[PDB]
């Protein structure tokens, strides 16, 4: 039970959920693709991305932390810090 | 005689021996939970022999083996009562507990305090078998308070959680409110019948038994979570799933029902106590099964299921059928512990997910849990010739064909439909449909501990109603002549509940979004009862505990009247006496006034 | 907008120190360095010896006192034979047969 | 309202938080995934309708009656994540989160069971006690007069320094000890 | 339209349904910023002592000591005997004593009157 | 700790109110004391009477179980408004509507139990018939007396 998350696995899953989102073309996306500057998304889209991250990994990200995760690497680092990966 | 009593006491001493082993320890254990599971399995096997030789002859006895204390006319002894109720309930409790502990060796495996958990679960089992085997009210009160305290310690297992401690203190609060009536009943029997033993209570046979039966009904209201004192049993789901499966489904919560069944020669001669039990049980089984229709946490739904079944047990005590109520206890234990174990298998397979709106598609992903959950739901609703058919249907056939409070019967039938409704709510949101759980699947149920522990209660939930209902002796006369609409009432109402709730479930896939009614908010917010009573009644106490009693009385007024007024008075008189100006003139003028008052006004020279 | 550069720098530095701490919570292959320390005996010690103790206790201390183990008298039917007497209980009257 | 860094929520932040709360309560009302997905795109359209509203009084008014909309249409038992506050497993493992300083109170016969771990703990404690005075003098040379204005902390500005007030963030217990 | 939420003593108003929540006025900005500054100064004052390696003990909280001193020792030096406290001390201090006195007195007079008339069923009552 | 940081008497002058507000670590505009009726509060602030459940749970509190910071002026009933105790959190349904619905449901159910007790259901049967004078010796009748003959006939 309870398989341990790694940085590579979390990165794969976050980029995987973002490659299934029809407002992001999956060839322009990288780990540092900023959602408002590089990917050109709405703040509503950023909220929906963080809610899909919550539905993916199973834990709520609070709004004071949700309104600041603006690239996928920030999301991977946040899930890493809140789940203590690479023990 | 020598076989029966020996194996009777061997069961209890054998259950106490791992408590001595865990208290007399030095080493890190070579699987102490396997030791306790082997112990309870062998105690079940040992307890089956007095059960079988009770089935052969009806052999009952009383082991009053240790004289404890003689308060002048009250000889309190360690007195065990091996009658029908002990002889049937102790194997059922041991069998369920053996299943719960082989489940617990899987479920509580990540817990670093697993030995403390098995110790506490065995202490619960010891206190429950002190309760169900007791002959006097003091020893029954020992088992009563013991299962209450082990309920506290096992609800508040994860004690860094605020809600677990809150739920445990809530359970203690409601059970002490029941203990008011229990100690009322003990006081009545001591003062009026000079006894706590059941034999002298039954032989003196009191007629004016309104007040002790009201005390026993209050004790059963506290212990079996009846209406007025119900919400601690849905709060009690905050403890681990073996705790909710053993204690708060099948074994602990029947102790108030077992208390009123144990006093059946007094409830059979009191129509007012029967009407109180009937109305209270019908109220509880309506209210909790109505609350279960719209809940989303699966353990809350099964807790309202077991409280609705306890309300049904209180109903069938209220219609003067105590042995059918005890048969429904023994029947209910199997499938309700199994439904909680299936819920725990789902919760552990979905990574501590307990909500039914993040489930689904588990018909094939968890096939053994699906099979056992369907069999448990059909045993709950009263599928014919499963275990719940052999008591509950007969209960309905005795609740129809009797001089009954008709509104209580009608609410009992509405509750019977509601059972089918929430059972297929469980089946629809948990097993059927499509997945709603997160995307990393860790679904696995292939541990032989889990499989065998669900399997033995599955064999129970298939065959145990048949086997027990054909082994027990007749203690009443069964009503077996009734019209065809009245014989088919339980099955038809159950099928109509299934049909109506299938309609409700098929409307959930539709693209229609309505605002919720007051009926939904009443069924979902628990009849508004813990929202009111847990905010208002503590408030009115605690403010009175600080503004009135603490600050106003015992920091101000009781401090004002005796010590502060006296201290200020002596201070003021001290400042009057010593405020002299040192003038010799004034002191001698006071001396002359003294002599004049002494001679003329006081006459001290006559 | 998201983080300031000071917040990104602080979270990166705290993240590096946290990952070093969590890595340093691991174990050595020698650790924990411990100090240097019959098939059915459960049916003998936990069952059979308590049956011996409890049978001795009930036979020579409990049943030797009155009314301590009081058994319900066995059920008697028409047609039985008493073991202590030999007195055959007479059977019931002939039935007015109903079917 | 109540935030560590900011004194308030902006209007934009209030709209975002109402949007997320509305979608979570909608998912609580609209259990199945396709049905939720349909009504969630409809709610996204309802939020896209008044996106380009420049009158701040009108936008604040629309946010206020949207809050009243949400308060009428909320679920009585919304879905809470298990480790979210109000969850079933929320603060469950807090009884297992023993702090690090208790390792200082251990007996030397039970510290000798883990020689490498405590030998590695000693350099963490040494790093902390040599960084402490540098980070205190970093905090006092950078905090404005009248005390700090926000609860944010500066990072390590020099090479070799550690960020100020770092020990009970780094050495916090795990979520599953 | 929609039913307005009616707040109570034990069910308060939500943060989002309060009309003062949407204040963009500069005086509320000053109040929120000054509360932020007080909270940040108290936070910094706490976690300087909390993160100290040399400190081994209890970070004393003068708010907590102040609360216990107000709950315990400050009550009598800020008491004044007036109309309100006298009526509440007579209502809550001797009122229930009078009430339970008359209840238990009436009950025991009734019981004793039944016993000395041979009316109370006291057939097996020999433990007292 | 020393004398001028302990709670004192009720402030009347605005400089005493300002010194009290500085003592309790809060703004003068937010510092309301209890009304000076002589109940024993003194200068202690009337905090707005909320439970600690309503505090922001994702905020990093100095006391996370209590949801309370260090140095923050505690409520007078802080031991009462802990999360193990009395909650003031906003309810989905109005409080008066909850009270009316629960009282109506309980009163209506008790009224209908009284109605069904007044009008009970039964079966179209006579009394259950027992031999031997309604089982006179079995029900505890003394054998020296003799009951009146209770006779049941065939039908
Ligand atoms: C029947 C007749 C015979 C009976 C016996 C004699 C009668 C007197 C009673 C017994 C003696 C009591 C004390 C008398 C002296 C008063 C004290 C005094 O000097 O006060 C001034 C002065 C007060 O001034 P202060 O200090 O500036 O403060 C006052 C404030 O500025 C401002 O204060 P203020 O403005 O409020 O007024 C001050 C004053 C004002 O006090 C009053 O106005 C109260 C007057 C009495 C009220 C109660 C009357 C009740 C009558 C009985 C009920 C009637 C029916 C009865 C039916 C039968 C029973 C049911 O109060 C006091 O001085 C308080 C202290 C003294 C208490 C006196 C208690 C009297 C008890 C009466 C029982 C009867 O105090 C002193 O100087 C203190 C030092 C005195 C030391 C020497 C005292 C010696 C007394 C000896 C008396 C007996 C002689 C023995 C001879 C035989 C042996 C040799
Ligand atoms: C493995 C270790 C066990 C012992 C190993 C060595 C012995 C091996 C076994 C052989 C048997 C030994 C001899 C027989 C035992 C003694 C027999 C005997 O007559 O003993 C004298 C008596 C028997 O009763 P009694 O009537 O003779 O004397 C009682 C004393 N008076 C009269 C003054 C009141 O005492 C015992 O047997 C004591 C042990 C009793 C066993 C149960 C204890 C339960 C404790 C519960 C505490 C709380 C209870 C409160 C509620 C009570 C109910 C309301
Ligand atoms: C036990 C006896 C079961 C058989 C007799 C009752 C059958 C019945 O009433 O079936 C109605 C219904 C199925 O019919 P329906 O839901 O309308 O159509 C679905 C498409 N086949 O619903 C069902 O059959 C489901 C409920 C069955 C309940 C069985 C346990 C009681
Ligand atoms: C129930 C019984 C109720 C009465 C019990 C006795 C009174 C209460 C206990 C003694 C007084 C308590 C106390 O501390 O009083 C303080 C008060 C001022 O005295 P001070 O020395 O200034 O105080 C210490 C310095 N901070 O002290 C005073 O004002 C002096 C009080 C002296 C009282 C002595 C007892 C007199 C009893 C007989 C009266 C005739
Ligand atoms: C009575 C009454 O109204 O007393 C008020 C009086 C002070 O009157 P004030 O309101 O200051 O004008 O206050 C007084 O005169 C002092 C207190 C009067 C007597 C109160 C008696 C009961 C006290 C509580 C006892 C608890 C046990
Ligand atoms: C046959 C007859 C049947 C009669 C039935 C009807 C009669 C009884 C009526 C109901 C009375 C009891 C119910 C009211 C009190 C309930 C107290 C309680 O459990 O409160 C729970 C509360 C917090 O729990 P909660 O908010 O629900 O948890 C959510 C998760 N955070 O926890 C707290 O806030 C902690 C509070 C601790 C202090 C409690 C103070 C109040 C104590 C009340 C005692 C009442 C005694 C009555 C005696 C009667 C004698 C005859």
In words, what does this structure look like?
The structure is cut from a larger assembly and holds chains A (87 residues), B (606 residues), C (99 residues), D (177 residues), E (128 residues) and F (155 residues). Chain A is an all-alpha fold. Chain A has one domain (1-87). Chain A has helices at 7-19, 43-57, 63-66, 72-83. In chain A, helix 1 (7-19) packs across helix 2 (43-57). Chain A is globular and about 40 Å long. Chain B is mainly alpha-helical and 606 residues long. Chain B has a two-stranded antiparallel ribbon. In chain B, helix 10 runs antiparallel to helix 15 (322-349) and helix 17 (367-381) runs antiparallel to helix 19. Chain B is globular and about 115 Å long. Chain D is mainly alpha-helical. Chain E is 53% helix and 0% strand. The relative contact order of chain E is 0.03. Chain E is an all-alpha fold and 128 residues long. Chain E contains 4 helices and no strands. The chains are: A mainly alpha (87), B mainly alpha (606), C mainly alpha (99), D mainly alpha (177), E mainly alpha (128), F mainly alpha (155). Strand 1 (61-71) of chain B pairs antiparallel with strand 1 (69-71) of chain C, so a sheet runs across the interface. Bound molecules: cardiolipin, 1,2-diacyl-SN-glycero-3-phosphocholine (PC1) and 1,2-Distearoyl-sn-glycerophosphoethanolamine (3PE) (4 copies). 1,2-diacyl-SN-glycero-3-phosphocholine (PC1) sits between chains B (66-68, 76, 78, 136, 138-139) and C (53, 56-57, 61).
The largest pleated sheet of chain D is described as: none
Greatest interface (CB-CB under 8 A), with counts per chain? E-F, 45 and 42 residues
Structural class call of chain A reads mainly alpha
Percent of residues in helices of chain A comes to: 40-55%
Radius of gyration of chain D over alpha carbons?
24 Å
* Strand portion of chain A: under 5%
Distance between the termini of chain D: 34 Å
Secondary structure tally, helices of chain A: 4
Range of helix content of chain D:
40-55%
Number of domains of chain A: 1
List ligands, each type once. cardiolipin, 1,2-diacyl-SN-glycero-3-phosphocholine, 1,2-Distearoyl-sn-glycerophosphoethanolamine
Give, in order, the helices and strands of chain A.
HHHH
Number of beta-strand segments of chain A:
0
Shape of chain A: globular
Spatial shape of chain D:
flat
Distance between the termini of chain A: 17 Å
Oligomer: part of a larger assembly
Number of separate helices of chain D: 6
Rg of chain A, nearest Å: 12 Å
PDB class: electron transport
Keywords: proton pump, oxidoreductase, membrane protein, electron transport
Entry title: Complex I during turnover, open2
Chain A: Acyl carrier protein
């Amino acid at each position: 039970d309870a398989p341990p998350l790694t940085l590579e696995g979390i990165k794969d899953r976050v980029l995987y959920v973002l490659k299934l989102y029809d407002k992001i073309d999956p060839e322009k996306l990288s780990v540092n693709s900023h959602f408002m500057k590089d990917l050109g998304l709405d703040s509503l889209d950023q909220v929906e991305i963080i809610m899909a991250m919550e539905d993916e990994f199973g834990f709520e990200i609070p709004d004071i932390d949700a309104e600041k995760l603006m690239c996928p690497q920030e999301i991977v680092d946040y899930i890493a810090d809140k789940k203590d990966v690479y023990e | 005689m020598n076989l029966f009593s020996s194996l009777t006491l061997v069961t209890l001493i054998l259950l106490t021996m791992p408590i001595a082993a865990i208290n007399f320890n030095t080493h890190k254990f070579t699987n102490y939970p396997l030791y306790v599971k082997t112990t309870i399995s062998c105690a079940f096997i040992t307890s089956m022999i007095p059960t079988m030789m009770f089935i052969h002859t009806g052999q009952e006895m009383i082991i009053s083996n240790w004289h404890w204390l003689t308060i002048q006319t009250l000889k309190l002894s360690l007195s065990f009562k091996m009658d029908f109720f002990s002889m049937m309930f102790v194997p059922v409790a041991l069998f369920v507990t053996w299943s719960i502990m082989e489940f617990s060796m899987w479920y509580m495996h990540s817990d670093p305090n697993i030995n403390q958990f098995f110790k506490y679960l065995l202490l619960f089992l010891i206190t429950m078998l002190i309760l169900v085997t007791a002959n006097n009210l003091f020893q029954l009160f020992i088992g009563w308070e013991g299962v209450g305290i082990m309920s506290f310690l096992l609800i508040g297992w994860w004690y860094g959680r605020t809600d677990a401690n809150t739920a445990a203190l809530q359970a203690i609060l409601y059970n002490r409110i029941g203990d008011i009536g229990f100690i009322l009943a003990m006081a009545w029997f001591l003062i009026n019948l000079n006894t706590w033993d059941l034999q002298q209570i039954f032989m003196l046979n009191p007629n004016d038994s309104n007040l002790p039966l009201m005390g026993l009904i209050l004790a059963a209201t506290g212990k079996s979570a009846q209406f007025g004192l119900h919400p601690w049993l849905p709060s009690a789901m905050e403890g681990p799933t073996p705790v909710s499966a053993l204690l708060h489904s099948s074994t602990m919560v029947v102790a108030g029902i077992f208390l009123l069944i144990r006093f059946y020669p007094l409830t059979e001669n009191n129509k007012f106590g029967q009407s109180i039990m009937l109305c209270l049980g019908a109220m509880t089984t309506l209210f909790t099964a109505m609350c279960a229709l719209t809940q989303n946490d699966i353990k809350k739904i099964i807790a309202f299921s077991t409280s609705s079944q306890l309300g049904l047990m209180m109903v069938t005590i209220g219609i003067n059928q105590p042995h059918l109520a005890f048969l429904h206890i023994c029947t209910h234990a199997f499938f309700k512990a199994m439904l909680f174990m299936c819920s725990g298998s789902i919760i552990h397979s979905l990574n501590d997910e307990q909500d039914i709106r993040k489930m689904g598609g588990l018909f094939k992903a968890m096939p053994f849990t699906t099979t056992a959950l369907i069999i448990g739901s059909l045993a709950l609703t009263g599928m014919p010739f499963l275990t719940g058919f052999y008591s509950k249907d007969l209960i309905i056939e005795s609740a129809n064909t009797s001089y009954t409070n008709a509104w209580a019967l009608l609410m009992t039938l509405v509750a019977t439909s509601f059972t089918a409704i929430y059972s297929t709510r469980i089946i629809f949101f948990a097993l059927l449909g499509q997945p709603r759980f997160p995307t990393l699947i860790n679904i696995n149920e292939n541990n032989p501990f889990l499989i065998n522990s669900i399997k033995r209660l599955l064999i129970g939930s298939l065959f145990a109603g048949f086997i027990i209902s054909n082994n027990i002796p007749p203690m009443t006369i069964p009503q077996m002549t009734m019209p065809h609409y009245l014989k088919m009432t339980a099955l038809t109402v159950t099928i109509l509940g299934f049909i109506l709730a299938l309609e409700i479930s098929n409307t959930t896939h539709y693209l229609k979004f309505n605002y919720p009614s007051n009926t939904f908010k009443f069924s979902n917010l628990l009849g508004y009862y813990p929202t009111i009573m847990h905010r208002l009644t503590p408030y009115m106490n605690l403010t009175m505990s600080q503004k009135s009693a603490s600050s106003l009385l015992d920091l101000i007024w009781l401090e004002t009247i005796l010590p502060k007024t006296i201290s200020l008075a002596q201070m003021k008189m001290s400042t009057t006496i010593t405020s002299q100006k040192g003038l010799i003139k004034l002191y001698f003028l006071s001396f002359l006034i003294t002599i004049l008052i002494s001679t003329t006004l006081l006459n001290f020279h006559e | 907008s998201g983080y300031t550069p000071d917040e990104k720098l602080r979270l990166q530095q705290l993240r590096e120190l946290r990952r070093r701490w969590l890595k340093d919570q691991e174990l050595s292959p020698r650790e924990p360095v411990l100090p240097p320390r019959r098939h059915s005996i459960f049916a003998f010690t936990h069952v059979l010896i308590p049956v011996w103790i409890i049978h001795y206790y009930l036979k020579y201390h409990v049943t030797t006192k009155p009314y301590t183990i009081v058994e319900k008298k066995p059920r008697i039917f028409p047609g039985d034979t008493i073991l202590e007497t030999g007195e055959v209980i007479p059977p019931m009257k002939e039935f007015p047969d109903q079917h | 309202a109540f935030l560590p860094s900011a004194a308030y929520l902006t209007h934009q932040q209030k709209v975002l938080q109402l949007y997320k709360r509305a979608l979570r309560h909608l998912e609580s009302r609209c259990v199945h995934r396709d049905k939720y997905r349909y009504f969630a795109c409809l709610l996204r359209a309802r939020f896209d309708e008044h996106k380009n509203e420049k009158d701040m009084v009108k936008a604040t008014q629309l946010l206020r009656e949207a809050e009243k909309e949400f308060w009428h249409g909320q679920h009585p038992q919304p879905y809470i994540f298990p480790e979210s506050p109000g969850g079933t497993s929320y603060e469950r493992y807090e009884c297992y989160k023993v702090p690090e300083w208790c390792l200082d109170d251990w007996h030397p016969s039970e510290k000798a069971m883990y020689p490498d771990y405590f030998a590695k703990r000693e350099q963490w404690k040494k790093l902390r006690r040599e960084s402490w005075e540098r980070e205190v003098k970093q905090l006092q040379e950078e905090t404005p007069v009248g005390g700090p204005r926000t609860e944010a902390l500066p990072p390590a500005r020099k090479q070799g320094d550690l960020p100020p007030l770092w020990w009970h963030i780094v050495t916090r217990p795990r979520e599953r000890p | 339209s929609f039913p307005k939420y009616e707040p109570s003593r034990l069910a308060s108003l939500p943060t989002t349904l309060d009309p003062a929540e949407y204040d963009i006025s500069s005086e509320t900005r000053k109040a929120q910023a000054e509360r932020l500054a007080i909270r940040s100064r108290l936070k910094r004052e706490y976690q300087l002592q909390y993160n100290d390696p040399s400190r081994r003990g209890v970070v004393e909280d003068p708010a907590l000591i102040r609360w216990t001193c107000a709950r315990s020792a400050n009550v009598y030096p800020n008491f004044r005997p007036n109309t309100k406290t006298s009526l509440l001390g007579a209502l809550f201090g001797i009122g229930p004593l009078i009430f339970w006195y008359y209840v238990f007195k009436t009950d025991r007079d009734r019981k004793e009157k039944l016993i000395q008339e041979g009316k109370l069923d006291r057939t097996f009552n020999i433990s007292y | 700790i020393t004398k001028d940081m302990l709670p004192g008497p009720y402030p009347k002058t605005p400089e005493e109110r300002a010194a009290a507000a500085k003592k309790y670590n809060m703004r003068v505009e937010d510092y309301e004391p209890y009304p000076d009726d002589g109940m024993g509060y003194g200068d202690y602030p009337k905090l707005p009477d909320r439970s600690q459940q309503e505090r922001d749970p994702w905020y990093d509190w100095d006391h996370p179980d209590l949801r309370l910071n260090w140095g923050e002026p505690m409520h007078w009933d802080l031991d009462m408004y802990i999360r193990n105790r009395v909650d003031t959190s906003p309810t989905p349904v109005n409080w008066n509507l909850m009270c009316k619905h629960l009282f109506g449901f309980v009163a209506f159910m008790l009224f209908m139990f009284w109605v069904g007790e007044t009008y009970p259901t039964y079966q179209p049967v006579g009394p259950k018939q027992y031999p031997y004078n309604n089982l006179y010796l079995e029900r505890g009748g003394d054998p020296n007396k003799e009951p009146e003959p209770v006779v049941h006939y065939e039908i």
